[PDB]
């Protein structure tokens, strides 16, 4: 059977970067011709493997991570980055083997009144491990005095909204990202 790549790429709803979702791909034959022979993507950057030789290859299972970030934050979805998205939202390992695909979604993910649904984590104790996921909304304590669950001075809410609008620059427009991870069932 064909692997359901349309369920992640052509998915109607996409999650926030802080609460990115992962989908496991098990016994099915893959078809990377759809992903490779298309100019719809804005980046499409592969690491550890090539964008063409993958057709005649097999893996134990494939993991598809999906989320939404700004245009300038797409560069952080790569091995060896230290931005806010890479440190507090979604981090890739140094020995990552896969491809990162992103495309502009200004027409569906950005509204005139401001789309504040897509969020991201701005404050967190230490960085995230590779492939770690944090959905905690606990009040971040930046000062020495305790917060006591009520955000205040030196006590900030950990999540902030992107606030996408169609008149923003290309670097601030919403981009849907799909990270395909390869682990060593799935063949071409």
């Amino acid at each position: 059977n064909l692997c359901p790549f349309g369920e992640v790429f052509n998915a109607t709803k996409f999650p926030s970067v802080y609460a990115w979702e992962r989908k496991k791909i098990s016994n099915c034959v893959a078809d990377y011709s759809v992903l490779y022979n298309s100019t719809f993507f804005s980046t499409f950057k592969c690491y550890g493997v090539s964008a063409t030789k993958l057709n005649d290859l097999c893996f134990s299972n494939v993991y598809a991570d999906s989320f939404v970030v700004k245009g300038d934050d797409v560069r952080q979805i790569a091995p060896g980055q230290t931005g806010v998205i890479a440190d507090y939202n979604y981090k890739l390992p140094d020995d990552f083997m896969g491809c990162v695909l992103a495309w502009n979604t200004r027409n569906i993910d950005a509204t005139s009144t401001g789309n504040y649904n897509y969020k991201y984590r701005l404050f967190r104790k230490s960085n995230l491990k590779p492939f770690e996921r944090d959905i905690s909304t606990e009040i971040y304590q930046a000062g020495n005095k305790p917060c006591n669950g009520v955000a205040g001075f030196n006590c900030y809410f950990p999540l902030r909204s992107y606030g996408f609008r169609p008149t923003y620059g290309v670097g601030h427009q919403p981009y849907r990202v799909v990270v395909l991870s390869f682990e060593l069932t799935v063949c071409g």
């Binding site: 404050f123 008149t167 620059g169 290309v170 670097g171």
Partner: protein
């Protein structure tokens, strides 16, 4: 947690939360300036008051971090910007009355209109009524009427409001650890923290006066040449040794002598460089003007204009179906949104202005990576200087011939260059004594050196001595002629126009050396110079992170403003003026008046 680390996290919250509210306030005022309706004027105020209330909340929130406990110089600048109490240091009633007089002065300046005693049904306001008279009329009495009526009608009303304006502004600056309101304005040039690049607020007064002494010889010869030409235009009205009457200078205040070119042109027989008719015959539209300006910045190494610029800018007049303010402005709404508001027409004056406003956008695009509180020019004069050097290169005959707007057989005689330099000097160097004297008068008023009973007495004593301009009719303390200018009655500093003028020629000389120019400085075009573009971009990206003395050094190689590049630009004209004034009187007597 370290106070330095707590402040960094606080700035992270601010930079992300302020960038979103600043975009809503900027887009709200954009929808008003491009579509003047009542629904949009309230949305501009709602998003404006929301940004003001947000900025005040973060102001007191930032004050809870001791500025002395921070060692990082970059974060220390951001905290100091937010910790400014500003106008909120006054009481609830004094701050409300201060905004009341600030609005009343701005109102009566824009709505004040004078009527002709000869024809009472003919009443004209400043724009375009009185400005058209001061710029075109050659009648002594007609210009004297428009000059005196503007200072006796709308000027006398500003006198009581400006008195309360000074005392309230002084109560603000003295409460924020400043000497006076003039010391508050000079704080824009203040640098304190970097060894070898510091600059005190009092150092500005010393440097502006030291550089102005070297401008006196060039201005005195220009003043003597203009006076000789003005005597032929107004015989039996001007003394060959006295100051120039104020109502004969080209505009309402004598700020610019541009309108005197028709009366002071050295060689009127030679062809004027107006390429307006050329582009109309070559099928140019408003889109082509900005496309050609975009190609100019790309030729020097700067990037293209963003897609959002071509999608969101208003480059043409929407007409009677949508009223809009046609003041050419460059908008930086943030979040990658760069726009330009300009009702562009197919003329040469709009072609050069397109390079000026797009120069502001290239400056905004450069420091976009800096944090929010650092996305601004080095000082108040850096931004206008960047836009002016573009119009200097775009106005050279070498650039106009290369594009196709000037005929290839246009001969550049030594008299055409004197005609061009004389036109530049009437606008550039003619405003320097006016700018310095005006800000010097307000500095003394704020400092407390000019009592109220001799405001206008000392105002015209400096006009005679510094600018060399005498009033046509005597004015007592009932008048308030300085307030009759926009920048004075609308609470704007004016020394920025003096510093920007010296900056733009230091930049030009620095870029033309990187551009490998070899001829005179006024014939230089920095087109195709990726070295000059890289040299200029190295300072545009700094924004306000590094001190202006360091940013200026990154391009011109000097830690302070210099007047030498300004004199080299007008050097061929300075030697020509000295030859013309060999049988004239260079200088003026501060005692002659057209009414003694």
């Amino acid at each position: 947690s370290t106070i330095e680390e707590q402040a960094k996290t606080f700035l992270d919250k601010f930079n992300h939360e302020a960038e979103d509210l600043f975009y809503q306030s900027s887009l709200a005022s954009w929808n008003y300036n491009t579509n003047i309706t009542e629904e949009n004027v309230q949305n501009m105020n709602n998003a404006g008051d929301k940004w003001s209330a947000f900025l005040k909340e973060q102001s007191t929130l930032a004050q809870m971090y001791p500025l002395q406990e921070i060692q990082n110089l970059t974060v220390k600048l951001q905290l100091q910007a937010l910790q400014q109490n500003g106008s909120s240091v006054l009481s609830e009633d004094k701050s409300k009355r201060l905004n009341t007089i600030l609005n009343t002065m701005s109102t009566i300046y824009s709505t004040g209109k004078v009527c002709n005693p000869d024809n009472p049904q003919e009443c004209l306001l400043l724009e375009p009524g009185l400005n058209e008279i001061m710029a075109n009329s050659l009648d002594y009495n007609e210009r004297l009427w428009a000059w005196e009526s503007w200072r006796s009608e709308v000027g006398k009303q500003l006198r009581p409001l400006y008195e309360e304006y000074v005392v309230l502004k002084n109560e603000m600056a003295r409460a924020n650890h400043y000497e006076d309101y003039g010391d508050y304005w000079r704080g824009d040039y203040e640098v304190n923290g970097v060894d070898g690049y510091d600059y005190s607020r009092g150092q500005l007064i010393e440097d502006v006066e030291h550089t102005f002494e070297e401008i006196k010889p060039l201005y005195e010869h220009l003043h003597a040449y203009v006076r000789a030409k003005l005597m032929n235009a107004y015989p039996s009205y001007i003394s060959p040794i006295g100051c120039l009457p104020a109502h004969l200078l080209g505009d309402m205040w004598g700020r610019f002598w541009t309108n005197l070119y028709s009366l002071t042109v050295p060689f009127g027989q030679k062809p004027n460089i107006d390429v307006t008719d050329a582009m109309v015959d070559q099928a140019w539209d408003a889109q082509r003007i900005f496309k050609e300006a975009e190609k100019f910045f790309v030729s020097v190494g700067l990037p293209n204009m963003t897609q959002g610029f071509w999608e969101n800018s208003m480059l043409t007049d929407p007409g009677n179906v949508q009223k809009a303010v046609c003041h050419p402005t460059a908008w930086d709404l943030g979040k990658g949104d760069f726009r330009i508001l300009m009702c562009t027409k197919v003329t040469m004056d709009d072609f050069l202005t397109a390079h000026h406003e797009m120069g502001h956008i290239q400056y905004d695009m450069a420091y976009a990576a800096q944090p929010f509180l650092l996305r601004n020019g080095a000082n108040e004069g850096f931004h206008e200087a960047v836009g002016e050097i573009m119009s200097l290169s775009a106005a050279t005959p070498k650039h106009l011939k290369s594009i196709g707007l000037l005929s290839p057989d246009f001969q550049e005689d030594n008299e055409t260059e004197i005609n061009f330099l004389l036109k530049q000097a009437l606008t550039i160097v003619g405003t320097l004594p006016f700018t310095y004297m005006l800000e010097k008068w307000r500095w003394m008023v704020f400092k407390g050196e000019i009592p109220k009973d001799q405001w206008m007495k000392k105002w015209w004593e400096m006009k005679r001595e510094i600018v060399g301009v005498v009033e046509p009719v005597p004015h007592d303390e009932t008048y308030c002629d300085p307030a009759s200018l926009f920048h004075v009655s609308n609470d704007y500093s004016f020394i920025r126009y003096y510093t920007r003028t010296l900056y733009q020629f230091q930049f030009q000389e620095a870029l033309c050396q990187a551009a490998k120019h070899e001829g005179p400085l006024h014939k230089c075009d920095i087109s195709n110079s990726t070295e000059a573009g890289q040299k200029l971009f190295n300072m545009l990206r700094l924004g306000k992170s590094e001190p202006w003395t360091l940013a200026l050094e990154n391009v011109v190689g000097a830690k302070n403003m210099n007047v030498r590049p300004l004199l080299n630009y007008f050097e061929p004209l300075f030697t020509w003026l000295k030859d013309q004034n060999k049988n004239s009187f260079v200088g003026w007597s501060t005692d002659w008046s057209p009414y003694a």
